[PDB]
Structure 1
Amino acid sequence: QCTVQVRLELGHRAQLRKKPTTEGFTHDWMVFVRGPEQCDIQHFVEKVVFWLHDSFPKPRRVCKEPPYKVEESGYAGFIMPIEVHFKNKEEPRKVCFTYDLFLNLEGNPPVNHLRCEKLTFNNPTTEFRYKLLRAGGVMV
């Protein structure tokens, strides 16, 4: 018996483009998944999948190594499914978040937002428990 907690940070940045794109997109934005300072989530994250709006081509964006991030231009915010796939052999294999990707509108300063997620793994296998603790996971 034991439980291991690890921390994830999902976030995004958005600002007006000085010059809109050829499509006339108003904003540059960037969405990421990272660990807190001095934590290496690569130890237990196999890959992160960023499910972009259907407008963007190849909207399935995969980061298999850090940095787990996507940079694009846009005209409006949307709901971005983000899938964090674990280096786990048993369940759960992944965790899904629906990320609120919103833009700074009507001359508000740039957007720079962070969403902190705590994952609780009950009775992980030996192999996966090492990866969690190597990433800076803590037993409770």
Structure 2
Amino acid sequence: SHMASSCAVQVKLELGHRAQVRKKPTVEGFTHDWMVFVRGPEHSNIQHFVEKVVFHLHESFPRPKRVCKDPPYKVEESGYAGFILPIEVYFKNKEEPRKVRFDYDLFLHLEGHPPVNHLRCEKLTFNNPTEDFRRKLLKA
């Protein structure tokens, strides 16, 4: 038996961050509050097909591996300097690819300049997924 149909699903993941200079720096002494997030556009659900999101913070951070298993996939923190932040997105999925890794640029602005509101769109294609993962991907 064989199939007469091919199916190709495209998903959009939004990753982004906000970064605000603190009024007073902490004892440590961090100068900014910032938050980094993974979400679907226009408040769409991605838990149907995302197993967990892994935020690899910089070494200088306590407990540098942060793991979110359920929405919101976000981390909130304070700091003094920007850095590359590899984000791993694991899928509710049988075969390759099981996860994918981005290098997210977590940058901060200086005092007297607006806060940071950065939004980045990444688009992935799953060519002929298994039927179960296709259902997870297009779930209402």
Which of 20, 23, 37 is residue 18 of structure 1 equivalent to? 23
The Cα shift of 1:124 comes to 0.4
Question: 1:93, 1:81 → 2: CA distance?
Answer: 16
Give the ranges of 4+ consecutive aligned residues of structure 1 lying more than 4 Å apart after TM superposition.
none
Which of 113, 116, 134 is residue 111 of structure 1 equivalent to? 116
What is aligned with 2:129?
A: 124
- Residue type at the aligned position of 2:59: D
Structure 1 unaligned segments of length 5 or more: list them.
136-140
The 5 Å alignment of 1:1-140 reads 1-134=6-139
Question: Which of the pair has more CA radius of gyration?
Answer: 2
RMSD of the TM alignment (CA)?
0.9
Asked if the contact 2:21/2:111 (under 8 Å) is kept, the reply is no
Question: 1:44, 1:80 → 2: CA distance?
Answer: 22
Question: 1:9, 1:38 → 2: CA distance?
Answer: 10
Tell me the alpha carbon deviations over residues 115-140 of structure 1, each in whole angstroms, 9 at most, x when there is no partner. Answer: 011110011000000011116xxxxx
Q: Mean Cα displacement is larger for which, 100-109 or 74-83? A: 100-109
Question: 2:82, 2:139 → 1: CA distance?
Answer: 35
Question: What's the TM-score, normalizing by structure 1?
Answer: 0.94
The Cα shift of 1:48 comes to 0.3
Question: 2:134, 2:78 → 1: CA distance?
Answer: 39
Question: What's the TM-score, normalizing by structure 2?
Answer: 0.94
Number of corresponding residues: 135
The Cα shift of 1:106 comes to 3.9
Structure 2 unaligned segments of length 5 or more: list them.
1-5
- Give identity over the alignment, percent: 83
- Residue type at the aligned position of 1:95: V
Question: 1:33, 1:44 → 2: CA distance?
Answer: 13
